[PDB]
Amino acid sequence: MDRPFKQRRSFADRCKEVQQIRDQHPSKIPVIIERYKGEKQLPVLDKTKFLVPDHVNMSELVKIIRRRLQLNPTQAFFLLVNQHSMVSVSTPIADIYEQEKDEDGFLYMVYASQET
Q: Which of 29, 42, 52, 96 binds ligand NOV (CB under 6 A)?
A: 52
CA-CA distances (angstroms) from residue 107 to 40, 70, 92, 114?
24, 23, 13, 20
Q: Which of 15, 56, 71, 87 binds ligand NOV (CB under 6 A)?
A: 56
φ and ψ of 83, to 5 deg: 75, 5
Q: Which stretch binds ligand NOV (CB under 6 A): 5-13, 18-26, 79-87, 97-105?
A: 18-26
Q: How many CB atoms are closer than 10 A to CB 114?
A: 14
Q: Which residues bind ligand NOV (CB under 6 A)?
A: 17, 20-21, 24-25, 28, 49-53, 56, 61, 64-65, 68
